[PDB]
Structures are given as C-alpha cells and as structure tokens.
Amino acid sequence: MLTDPIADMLTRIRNATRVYKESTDVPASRFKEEILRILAREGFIKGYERVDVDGKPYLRVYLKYGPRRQGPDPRPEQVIHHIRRISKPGRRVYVGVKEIPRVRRGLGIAILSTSKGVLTDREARKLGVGGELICEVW
C-alpha cells in the first residue's frame, strides 16, 4: 500500500523524465487525474490518457523534453526541472489566499486543492481562494 499516492505520481514522473522516457503509467484516481490536467495546461507534460495495464486502470502520462544539445552530453533540457510535494500526510500544509507561494518569480506553478477545485497559484489568486498546497513544479 502506497502511503502517499500523489507523491508516488509526482515521483514516477520525476524518475521517468530523468531518464527521458516516452511516457509512464501511474495508477488511476480522479485526484491524480485532476492534477495532470493542470500539468498539461501549463505545458509540463504533453498529455495524459486513461490506458489500462492488465485489468486495472492507469494514467499513461506522456512526457515532454527540450531539443538535443551540442557539447559533451547532448541529453535535452527537462521541461519539468523540479516537481516536489509540499503537503505530505502527517504534515499537511494549508495556505490562505494571502500566502499562496510565488514560485520562481512565476516561471513555475504551485498546485493547490481548494473548495473550488484543483487550481494553480494564479488560478486560486483570481478566484480568491486558498487550500492545501499540494506541490510546486518549475
């Protein structure tokens, strides 16, 4: 049993990107889904999809990297350089609309669950809500 499934996904992703996979399966959940939707909108992932690895439902996430580079070590630049869980179980982290993080001076997002749904830092600022700071990505 996975202790935190949001973090297992944020990670699965991070591990995949770091070896430049094409895509990767994370087991399905509306919430995980709700998050990836945002990753797509902001362009951190090409897309997601509801594949079905042997009977049980997964989310094929498709990754997006940079172009090839010149020099020793061509490996392209990650589009997701950094993706970290802010609120973890046994240390939940809620912020009010007044103290929602400015991530990398905004060259990056923070994803927070609110009573108005899963939103980005700029999305919650407009709507005027806080919630549970789930992760920053930049």
Partner 1 sequence: DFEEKMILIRRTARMQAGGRRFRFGALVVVGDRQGRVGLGFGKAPEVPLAVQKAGYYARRNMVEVPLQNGTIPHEIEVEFGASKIVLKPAAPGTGVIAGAVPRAILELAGVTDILTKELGSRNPINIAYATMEALRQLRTKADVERLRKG
Partner 2 sequence: VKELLEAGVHFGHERKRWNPKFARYIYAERNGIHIIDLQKTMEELERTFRFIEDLAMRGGTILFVGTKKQAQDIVRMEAERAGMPYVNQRWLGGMLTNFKTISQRVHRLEELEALFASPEIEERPKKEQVRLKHELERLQKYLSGFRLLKRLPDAIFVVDPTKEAIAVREARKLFIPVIALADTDSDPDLVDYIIPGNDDAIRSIQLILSRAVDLIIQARGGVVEPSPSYALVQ
Partner RNA sequence: GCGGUAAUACGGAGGGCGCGAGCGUUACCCGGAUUCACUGGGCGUAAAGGGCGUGUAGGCGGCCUGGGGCGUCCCAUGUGAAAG
Partner RNA sequence: CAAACCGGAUUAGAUACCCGGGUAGUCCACGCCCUAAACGAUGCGCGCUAGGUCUCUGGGUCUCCUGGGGGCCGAAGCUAACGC
Tell me which residues touch partner 1 (CB under 8 A): 42-44, 46, 64, 66, 77, 79, 104-108
State the minimum distance, in angstroms, from the CB of residue 9 to partner 2: 25
State the minimum distance, in angstroms, from the CB of residue 41 to RNA: 20
Q: Residue 29: which of 61, 5, 11, 53 has the closest Cα?
A: 5
Q: Which does 86 bind (CB under 5 to 8 A by kind): RNA, partner 2, partner 1, none?
A: none
Distance from C-alpha of 32 to C-alpha of 59, rounded to nearest angstrom: 9
Q: Which does 3 bind (CB under 5 to 8 A by kind): partner 2, RNA, partner 1, none?
A: RNA
Contacts to RNA from residues 93-132, by CB under 7 A: 94-98, 114-115, 128-132
Instruction: Give the distance, in angstroms, between the CA of residue 18 and the centroid of all CA atoms in the same chain.
Output: 15
Eight-state DSSP code of residue 64: -
Instruction: Give the distance, in angstroms, between the CA of residue 53 and the centroid of all CA atoms in the same chain.
Output: 21
Task: Work out the burial of residue 86: count CB atoms within 10 Å of its CB; fewer than 13 is exposed, 13-18 middle, 19 or more buried.
Answer: middle
Binding interface with RNA (CB under 7 A): 1-5, 8, 11-12, 15-16, 18-19, 21, 24, 27-32, 57, 89-90, 92, 94-98, 114-115, 128-132
